[PDB]
Ligand binder design. Structure first.
Ligand code: ST9
Ligand code: MPG
Ligand code: ZN
Ligand code: ZN
Length: 322
């Protein structure tokens, strides 16, 4: 059925394929390459600095990880890219601040790539085309120029819903000072001042390592979740169910389900099963900050499993009622 007719720019289009001849060579962006290397070097140095950190520093890092995660999953992903539920201003203010902490480009840019990632999955119009391998879909696409198909096909996507949202456009306008404050400055000064953590530890652990972990956990949804796992809902696509990815990406590891039903607010068959994001949204709904949560019916899901499933769903039947 059509449970979300307000938006259809994330529906997979099997019609579009790569038929423009041999693909052009990759064009390296050395500025991004250098910065990405230095970031992971600093993050690695943070790991060996963890045992010398205070308890609050480690706890603050986890808190900042989880909050930033919600900014991507509950906000950039399920809310603004897919429109799977409606959030009121206080929650949207939280999510837009949380998203800014995560530093994965502004919401508008994030959703524009993501809608293209769903419509033209596994093609040259897919920003993280998994056909190019693990490395490209993981981080490689952030180091090279986008394929012309991304710009052309993606440019035909409707983004007017995000253009008309004042909060989204507000973040885009002031994204540079925002990301500097929320992703680098504040999470470094807070441990430095509040519980007397050293500046070195706060910089490499509470900022560099944390941000590095958020990135790679997110990137695993593009790489690992497109290569390893089962496909209980649709075997014809490359999206996979990955439990480990769900743990790291607070519930975004059920990727086979999600690509099959991009309009589901839980991004999974079961709501709270290894899905902290859905649990968060449901809590917000209890407070009256969120509503119009769209869940695919059991009948539709069960019928799709019969039609295009790989047969691995038999082991996950009747886990929960919801
Ligand atoms: C724990 C949390 C777990 C969360 C799990 C959530 C899972 C969700 C599902 C998986 C998705 C997750 C993916 C998100 C992760 C990636 C985010 C980051 O890492 S970012 C990390 C930090 N951020 C970074 O590191 C940034 C690094 N990236 C870059 O520097 C560049 O983007 C580039 C070098 C990669 C491409 O360079 P280049 O080829 O020169 O292309 P340009 O970009 O410069 O575009 C210029 C023009 O092209 C046009 N156009 C482009 N795209 C589209 C489109 N999709 N459509 C239409 N048009 C498009 C447009 O006109 C644009 O103009 P304008 O918008 O300016 O007006
Ligand atoms: C207590 C001692 C800690 C020592 C290390 C501190 C490192 C500080 C730096 C970054 C924090 C990383 C936290 C990642 C949590 C991911 C599981 C998140 O998973 C979940 O919340 C659900 O399982 C997902 O559905
Ligand atoms: Zn995907
Ligand atoms: Zn999605």
């Amino acid at each position: 059925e059509d449970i979300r007719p307000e938006m259809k720019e994330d529906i997979h289009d099997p019609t579009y394929q790569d038929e423009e001849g041999p693909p052009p060579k990759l064009e390296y962006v050395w500025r991004n390459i250098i910065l990405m290397v230095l970031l992971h070097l600093g993050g690695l140095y943070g790991i060996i600095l963890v045992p010398s950190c205070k308890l609050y520093t480690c706890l603050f890092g986890i808190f900042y990880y989880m909050t930033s995660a919600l900014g991507i999953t509950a906000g950039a992903h399920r809310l603004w890219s897919h429109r799977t539920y409606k959030a009121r201003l206080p929650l949207r203010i939280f999510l837009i601040i949380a998203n800014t902490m995560a530093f994965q480009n502004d919401v508008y840019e994030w959703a524009r790539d993501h809608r293209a990632h769903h419509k033209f999955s596994e093609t040259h119009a897919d920003p993280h085309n998994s056909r190019r391998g693990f490395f490209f879909s993981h981080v490689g696409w952030l180091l090279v120029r986008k394929h012309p198909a991304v710009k052309e096909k993606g440019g035909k996507l409707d983004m007017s819903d995000l253009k008309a949202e004042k909060l989204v456009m507000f973040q885009r306008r002031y994204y540079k000072p925002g990301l500097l404050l929320m992703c680098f400055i504040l999470p470094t000064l807070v441990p430095w001042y509040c519980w007397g953590e050293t500046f070195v530890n706060s910089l490499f652990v509470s900022t560099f390592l944390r941000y590095t972990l958020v990135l790679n956990a997110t990137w695993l949804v593009n790489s690992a979740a497109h290569l390893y796992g089962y496909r209980p809902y649709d075997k014809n696509i490359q999206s996979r169910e990955n439990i480990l990815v769900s743990l790291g990406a607070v519930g975004e590891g059920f990727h086979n389900y999600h690509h099959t039903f991009p309009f589901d607010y839980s991004a999974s068959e079961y709501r709270w099963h290894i899905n902290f994001t859905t649990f968060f949204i449901d809590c917000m709904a209890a407070l009256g900050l969120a509503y119009d949560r769209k869940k695919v019916s059991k009948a539709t899901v069960l019928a799709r499993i019969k039609r295009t499933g790989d047969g691995s769903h038999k082991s996950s039947e009747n886990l929960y009622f919801q």
